[PDB]
Design an enzyme around this catalytic site. Structure first.
Site, PDB file in Angstrom:
ATOM      1  N   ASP A 192      -2.713   8.689   6.773  1.00 22.97           N
ATOM      2  CA  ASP A 192      -1.669   9.666   7.061  1.00 22.97           C
ATOM      3  C   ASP A 192      -1.887  10.344   8.406  1.00 22.97           C
ATOM      4  O   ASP A 192      -0.925  10.572   9.147  1.00 22.97           O
ATOM      5  CB  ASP A 192      -1.611  10.721   5.966  1.00 22.97           C
ATOM      6  CG  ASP A 192      -0.882  10.237   4.739  1.00 22.97           C
ATOM      7  OD1 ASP A 192       0.173   9.586   4.893  1.00 22.97           O
ATOM      8  OD2 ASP A 192      -1.364  10.519   3.624  1.00 22.97           O
ATOM      9  N   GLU A 194       9.125  18.018   4.130  1.00 26.79           N
ATOM     10  CA  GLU A 194       9.806  16.803   4.575  1.00 26.79           C
ATOM     11  C   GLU A 194      11.323  16.901   4.382  1.00 26.79           C
ATOM     12  O   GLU A 194      11.963  16.010   3.827  1.00 26.79           O
ATOM     13  CB  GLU A 194       9.227  15.581   3.842  1.00 26.79           C
ATOM     14  CG  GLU A 194       7.802  15.220   4.307  1.00 26.79           C
ATOM     15  CD  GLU A 194       7.102  14.189   3.433  1.00 26.79           C
ATOM     16  OE1 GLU A 194       7.590  13.917   2.307  1.00 26.79           O
ATOM     17  OE2 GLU A 194       6.070  13.623   3.888  1.00 26.79           O
ATOM     18  N   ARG A 216      11.253  18.223  -0.473  1.00 26.00           N
ATOM     19  CA  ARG A 216      10.334  17.693  -1.471  1.00 26.00           C
ATOM     20  C   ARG A 216       9.434  18.828  -1.943  1.00 26.00           C
ATOM     21  O   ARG A 216       8.762  19.470  -1.127  1.00 26.00           O
ATOM     22  CB  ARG A 216       9.513  16.552  -0.865  1.00 26.00           C
ATOM     23  CG  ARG A 216       8.184  16.209  -1.541  1.00 26.00           C
ATOM     24  CD  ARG A 216       7.464  15.165  -0.666  1.00 26.00           C
ATOM     25  NE  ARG A 216       6.179  14.738  -1.211  1.00 26.00           N
ATOM     26  CZ  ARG A 216       5.440  13.759  -0.707  1.00 26.00           C
ATOM     27  NH1 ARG A 216       5.822  13.089   0.371  1.00 26.00           N
ATOM     28  NH2 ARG A 216       4.292  13.437  -1.304  1.00 26.00           N
ATOM     29  N   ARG A 269       7.529   4.582  -6.586  1.00 22.36           N
ATOM     30  CA  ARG A 269       8.415   4.531  -5.423  1.00 22.36           C
ATOM     31  C   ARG A 269       8.964   3.108  -5.307  1.00 22.36           C
ATOM     32  O   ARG A 269       8.508   2.282  -4.509  1.00 22.36           O
ATOM     33  CB  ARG A 269       7.677   4.954  -4.160  1.00 22.36           C
ATOM     34  CG  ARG A 269       7.177   6.396  -4.184  1.00 22.36           C
ATOM     35  CD  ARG A 269       6.264   6.648  -2.999  1.00 22.36           C
ATOM     36  NE  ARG A 269       5.933   8.058  -2.870  1.00 22.36           N
ATOM     37  CZ  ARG A 269       5.317   8.587  -1.823  1.00 22.36           C
ATOM     38  NH1 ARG A 269       4.938   7.841  -0.797  1.00 22.36           N
ATOM     39  NH2 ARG A 269       5.071   9.894  -1.808  1.00 22.36           N
ATOM     40  N   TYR A 301      10.049   6.600   1.635  1.00 19.22           N
ATOM     41  CA  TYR A 301      10.850   7.692   2.165  1.00 19.22           C
ATOM     42  C   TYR A 301      12.293   7.256   2.392  1.00 19.22           C
ATOM     43  O   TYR A 301      12.594   6.078   2.580  1.00 19.22           O
ATOM     44  CB  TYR A 301      10.278   8.194   3.491  1.00 19.22           C
ATOM     45  CG  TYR A 301       9.064   9.066   3.341  1.00 19.22           C
ATOM     46  CD1 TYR A 301       8.368   9.109   2.138  1.00 19.22           C
ATOM     47  CD2 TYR A 301       8.619   9.862   4.388  1.00 19.22           C
ATOM     48  CE1 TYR A 301       7.266   9.920   1.981  1.00 19.22           C
ATOM     49  CE2 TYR A 301       7.518  10.682   4.237  1.00 19.22           C
ATOM     50  CZ  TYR A 301       6.842  10.700   3.027  1.00 19.22           C
ATOM     51  OH  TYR A 301       5.740  11.509   2.839  1.00 19.22           O
TER      52      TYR A 301
HETATM   53  C1  ZMR Z   1       1.159  15.529   7.228  1.00 19.36           C
HETATM   54  C2  ZMR Z   1       1.002  14.470   6.200  1.00 19.36           C
HETATM   55  O1  ZMR Z   1      -0.047  13.888   6.021  1.00 19.36           O
HETATM   56  N1  ZMR Z   1       2.184  14.122   5.393  1.00 19.36           N
HETATM   57  C3  ZMR Z   1       2.089  13.049   4.327  1.00 19.36           C
HETATM   58  C4  ZMR Z   1       2.637  13.569   3.169  1.00 19.36           C
HETATM   59  C5  ZMR Z   1       1.816  14.705   2.551  1.00 19.36           C
HETATM   60  O2  ZMR Z   1       0.587  14.208   2.162  1.00 19.36           O
HETATM   61  C6  ZMR Z   1       2.510  15.209   1.264  1.00 19.36           C
HETATM   62  O3  ZMR Z   1       3.807  15.630   1.530  1.00 19.36           O
HETATM   63  C7  ZMR Z   1       1.720  16.368   0.638  1.00 19.36           C
HETATM   64  O4  ZMR Z   1       1.671  17.407   1.498  1.00 19.36           O
HETATM   65  O5  ZMR Z   1       2.651  12.487   2.042  1.00 19.36           O
HETATM   66  C8  ZMR Z   1       2.844  11.162   2.428  1.00 19.36           C
HETATM   67  C9  ZMR Z   1       3.323  10.259   1.306  1.00 19.36           C
HETATM   68  O6  ZMR Z   1       3.543   9.080   1.504  1.00 19.36           O
HETATM   69  O7  ZMR Z   1       3.478  10.803   0.160  1.00 19.36           O
HETATM   70  C10 ZMR Z   1       3.025  10.748   3.957  1.00 19.36           C
HETATM   71  C11 ZMR Z   1       2.895  11.762   4.895  1.00 19.36           C
HETATM   72  N2  ZMR Z   1       2.096  11.259   6.071  1.00 19.36           N
HETATM   73  C12 ZMR Z   1       2.428  11.608   7.324  1.00 19.36           C
HETATM   74  N3  ZMR Z   1       3.632  12.458   7.597  1.00 19.36           N
HETATM   75  N4  ZMR Z   1       1.578  11.134   8.449  1.00 19.36           N
END
Ligand code: ZMR
Ligand code: ZMR
Ligand code: ZMR
Ligand code: ZMR
Ligand code: NAG
Ligand code: NAG
Ligand code: NAG
Ligand code: NAG
Ligand code: CA
Ligand code: CA
Ligand code: CA
Ligand code: CA
Lengths: 389, 389, 389, 389
Positions: free
Chosen positions: C71, C198, C214, C297, C331
């Site tokens: 992530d 998000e 979310r 998902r 997503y």
């Molecule tokens: C900043 C960050 O790491 N955002 C995560 C997001 C996050 O872990 C969840 O919303 C919980 O906070 O989940 C996931 C996911 O696939 O559930 C991808 C996102 N990855 C990225 N945007 N790089």
């Protein structure tokens, strides 16, 4: 609006601009689709310069690239690249099928011209912007062919030199006058007019054009054609200087007779080039290239003169060696970079690369322009054709 | 502002412009991601021409490129390339998912249209610039499909021919009238209207459009549809010439009966094309293509006529062979290059390349335009599908 | 001048625009450097739409592409591609390093925003055109993060939702108001404001914005945030419909209590999306997506409603299945295509591709827009991750 | 019209913009032709920023890329990429052959400058748009060389620092003043003027320029050159701060004597950089970088000060570590992003990648700009040169 010749930016020598060398990227492990090509030249609009060349519908490395030695086929096309883009498949833009070409920008649109068809009934088509606006069929039915360098546009009219007839004998050049790609006039070349292939042409002042050509049959002196765009006339001459510019050639000054005397050798040749300094009324200096070798297409040496090349047998003045004598050097081409305040003329060099007779063939292009006071550096390729995948 | 038809640049024959041949670059050792495709066509704005085609969401070489024989799938998309760019992954621009397509520029924005969906409930979506502005659902629920060549825009309105219904029987074409991608009107095709697939359409003067189509079920004569954009009407005809343009076809002139008589054969067919010369009031000459073979999709021969093709059974006049009879040649398409002073019409040829039935399938595209007085040269591919990695 | 919301082009369903599927080109024999990525979205100016995504400083095939499951790292960047260009190395444009992103065009210039830095002290930087004009540090020091879809610009001001705090507990969102990339104001979200990651945001009329978010900790209902740009206020709600849009989720309608009641489950979630029809005064229809599976998902199903989603517990109306239940679908994102006469809203789907836990991870992007009267076709990838080199 | 310095966008620290890392894509299985390079820098017009660098006429992977350690050869060229494009063969644009470079945009056209030629008689050529308008020959005949970062253009005039002479002794810098690429004036640097290589230059207010240079022979303090563009004068100084910015260097504050005292060590060095905050009348804050190691080119640490660096021996204020001490970090460069309302200054870092002495050599470029209140994150490459094919 329309392109027209201005006084050239002041300069007293030739100095290197850049070099394109796509087949440095065609070695083992490399990841590039490079475009093998021959007869390259450069032409410019006020917006951008472009490297034009004749391709073979193939990239290197690739299984079909063994045909790249051929002069004429149904595969070749006039293609171009923004000047400074390396010569790769994705950078290439195809303009017209054909195996002899020229192009020039009139201030509003590009004119592209190629000859397509069989040797005995070829046709020049002229594209203006996106449309084929002109068509000019072979008149001697023996390989109609043109400059392999940029044409010259003045006041909305573009001037293209074509030739048709035997490579080993008399072949009469013609000046085609185009307007939006349409051939509106043919100008008969008077005077010394029995040969004149692959002319490199530059405006010598506001209204005249001078072309430096190749006599493939009669003489090691290069033919010169002058065009008066106001009168609409053209006259051929033989360059008189003891410093003979074609290859192969006899020893300097050893041709006995008048300025227009052919000499006893003269068979074969190569496209040559020149650059110049000019005001709006007259050319004040000329810069010439020829090979180092008097028998092979190898090396490149720059010369200059302030004399009229159709009148003076004086030797040219040595500038220096731009490509060492051990390095193949084939065609060279004249071109002009237009500017808002002044114009600049340049010479490009086709540094040849080949695996041998009827084998893979292409080049690297080095560019020198009229600027400064001494030659800055010679050019090399550092490409060994054996290393090409 | 709005695009409208001008008088065409003078020309009395068809001569080669260029050819795109991406799979020359898909051989052993090559470094290119080439795009296999089918149903290519060309459409132009005043700024640039573009090569449109239907891809398969894959490049060649590649493991998934065995699906490229399929007509319809969830993978195909209408994509395009600046005309003259070779057909590689990085040059490609995706417009719309779907498996039947058309596109045309109205002077302000591109309209793109594809049919997407299952065979029994497909939907045409029309994209204007970047937005999907139009949607037209299947009306006979049996493979809604369209031209596979450019639509025609006049005075802010674009005209698209669609058909829906069995490939082997009656299927009624419809003329859709669009404005900024929105379908504002359907025009009923009267007259001879029981078939008419894959129409190649060109304006015949300032206000009328003529389309040359494919009757896949009833006749080796091609249907012709004329659209009056002022009256907003369309009428279907059968091309009357003894020189039948579809493939397969019986011997010339052997269909017995009136101009509109089907003939006893007629099953199967191929998309065909034409070009023309016109003033602002009338078409003065037409140029046609058909295959060399009367039974297979091989070769291409150009013809011309100054007669009305809906009224005269006179044979067409031979221009010559543009693609030799031993060379596969599938679809051909009409298109027009707009200019500031005159327009120009052209014919593109889908030179097919395939490893065989339900195996890898793509093409090379050769382009000929109305110019000059004699055909300049025929076209080849020099691609052997066995050599494709 | 400045971008502002217009009435949307008329449409009563969702129909497919296009799909990008770069890793079709990453199989054995292929010649493409494809860009593995996650959290893609689309944002548009009046000139062009662009596909934005977060990369990993690597292409596929390649030795380093095993990190693409992560992530957050020092490798990820917000990059973009002209919409319709396939996602290859040469087509990519890098905007900002960081691992959470958003972007939106205000009518004059792009604003790009990413969060960069360690989990406990990250910083959002905002780039306006070519300059970094804004900086917003973490306020809860626990993974500052933003929309992963486009922000909304109205009348020269852009609106970005950010959140900071635990993934499994209360985390307070904030609306940042930017002007030429500078954060000029923070808007406090009142009402139901304990979560909201998000967010997918769209203007609901000339002056209001609605975001669908979310809740990763408390509820399978999605939070909704409304912004009044004139008053400069924001209020949070919980979507009341029995048709719960998050994943994982309990059976429809089984959450007992008021509209704003969390429910007993609610842990975990996924970014969701919606589209709409609106006039200049009010939204008249909403379109929603959720997965086929209530626990994984996988799949995508479209729904619609003419009720207010913050007030009505009525079930949504089924449109149909856009991605079959056997196909991973992660997503989804909202975006709007501006036009000169009307605007159009769309939903993009992140069709996930992965070799498994902590292994190679990327996607294909399918796009559906508000147009027509029935769903045209579902989408597939036909990419088997095992086949990726 | 003409570019001129504005007040800088407010900012109190350095925060990361982006990073380019092309050789992440040169690993086993990868499909990219990446461009190995050294001496990168960035320069911007109002339209776009560009990453300039000196290449070696080769891509990686490739058989010829072992020469990439060389400083000077006939192969190197000044090339550039739109900022954010990764450094691949097809994205590259060649400007001029040569092995020392600079470039800057005056508001109307790019000026590009390189030094080409042998060590003992090199020539700087200056290209303005597409023409070579300027030529400046070596004046000490011992490796004429220039900034390896952008020049500064004010009110139609551009200012370039050149140096010529021994690397281990006195070498006198000169300020060249250009107008449309023509060298119209040389400014003599007075004061402390016995060295000053590879200057990073930024305007300090509406009419003055400050350059931070490298003394390769005499001192670990960096020379500073100030240019008064109105008076047309230049004066050299030695940076007085106890926090010595060159590498190698003695312990902070251990140089005994006046501000302008060399110190007993001082041999060797590296190009350094700074950024600043300014109004239209004065610079109000300066930001500096130096390596972590006092003996090797490794790591990068940011500092700041509100004192005059030519007058104060006060230690600089630590900002933090931008590149960890275990990571090679070679050149750094200053550049400025022009804006319509404010300007912004930035520092780029050449994160070096090499297989060793006289082996493959290139870099990754990380960019930090003046914005925010604390350093956001350090940068890494995650490229192991052993892994490069
Ligand atoms: C900043 C960050 O790491 N955002 C995560 C997001 C996050 O872990 C969840 O919303 C919980 O906070 O989940 C996931 C996911 O696939 O559930 C991808 C996102 N990855 C990225 N945007 N790089
Ligand atoms: C039309 C044509 O084939 N022109 C030839 C040219 C020609 O053979 C000689 O000038 C004699 O006429 O020579 C050569 C050459 O390298 O000498 C290349 C040219 N090849 C091409 N332009 N494709
Ligand atoms: C929509 C569709 O599938 N059109 C078919 C077309 C069609 O089968 C015949 O005209 C009979 O209706 O034939 C062929 C063909 O090569 O004959 C290609 C077209 N393929 C595509 N346009 N994808
Ligand atoms: C013209 C030239 O060769 N400049 C050198 C530079 C130079 O050796 C020192 O400053 C001493 O004069 O050092 C180095 C270096 O890494 O220290 C790279 C530069 N390489 C290039 N700019 N190509
Ligand atoms: C250009 O030169 C020719 C030949 O010397 C001369 O006749 C002509 O008048 C010149 N043109 C101008 C505009 O001076
Ligand atoms: C175009 O041709 C049609 C058919 O002959 C004719 O009815 C129409 O008047 C023509 N249009 C113009 C503008 O002359
Ligand atoms: C947009 O909707 C909100 C909420 O219903 C309303 O308060 C506002 O007045 C509307 N804006 C306009 C311009 O009608
Ligand atoms: C810029 O700074 C210099 C040095 O302090 C000063 O002499 C000059 O007047 C300043 N320029 C302006 C426009 O204030
Ligand atoms: Ca000769
Ligand atoms: Ca038929
Ligand atoms: Ca949840
Ligand atoms: Ca030093």
């Amino acid at each position: 609006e329309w392109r027209f010749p201005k006084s050239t930016c002041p300069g007293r020598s030739l100095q290197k601009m850049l070099q394109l060398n796509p087949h440095r990227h065609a070695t083992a492990g490399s990841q590039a689709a490079t475009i093998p090509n021959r007869e390259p030249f450069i032409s410019c609009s006020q917006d951008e310069c472009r490297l034009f060349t004749l391709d073979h519908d193939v990239s290197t490395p690739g299984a079909y690239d063994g045909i790249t030695w051929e002069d004429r086929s149904k595969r070749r096309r006039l293609v171009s690249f923004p000047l400074g883009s390396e010569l790769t498949l994705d950078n290439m833009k195809v303009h017209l099928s054909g195996w002899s070409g020229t192009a020039c920008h009139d201030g509003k649109e590009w004119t592209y011209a190629t000859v397509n068809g069989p040797d005995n009934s070829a046709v020049m088509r002229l594209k203006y912007g996106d449309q084929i606006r002109g068509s000019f069929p072979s008149y001697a039915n023996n390989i109609l062919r043109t400059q392999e360098s940029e044409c010259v546009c003045i006041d909305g009219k573009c001037y293209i030199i074509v030739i048709d007839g035997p490579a080993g004998g008399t072949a009469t050049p013609k000046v085609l006058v185009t307007r939006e790609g349409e051939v509106t006039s043919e100008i008969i070349v008077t005077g010394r007019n029995k040969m004149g292939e692959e002319c490199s042409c530059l405006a010598t002042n506001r209204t005249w054009i001078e072309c430096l050509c190749r006599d493939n049959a009669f003489s090691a002196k290069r033919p010169i054609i002058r065009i008066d765009t106001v009168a609409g006339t053209a006259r051929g001459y033989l360059m008189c200087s003891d410093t003979y510019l074609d290859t192969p050639r006899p020893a300097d000054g050893s041709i006995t007779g008048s300025c227009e005397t052919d000499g006893t050798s003269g068979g074969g040749g190569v496209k040559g080039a020149f650059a110049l300094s000019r005001t709006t009324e007259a050319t004040t200096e000329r810069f010439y290239v020829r090979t180092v070798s008097s028998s092979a297409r190898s090396g490149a040496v720059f010369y200059k003169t302030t004399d009229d090349p159709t009148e003076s047998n004086n030797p040219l003045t040595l500038i220096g060696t731009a490509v060492g004598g051990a390095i193949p050097m084939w065609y060279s081409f004249s071109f002009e970079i237009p500017g808002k305040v002044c114009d600049q003329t340049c010479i490009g060099l086709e540094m040849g690369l080949t695996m041998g007779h009827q084998l893979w063939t292409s080049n690297s292009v080095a560019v020198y322009c009229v600027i400064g006071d001494n030659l800055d550096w010679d050019s090399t390729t550092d490409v060994v054709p054996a290393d090409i995948v």
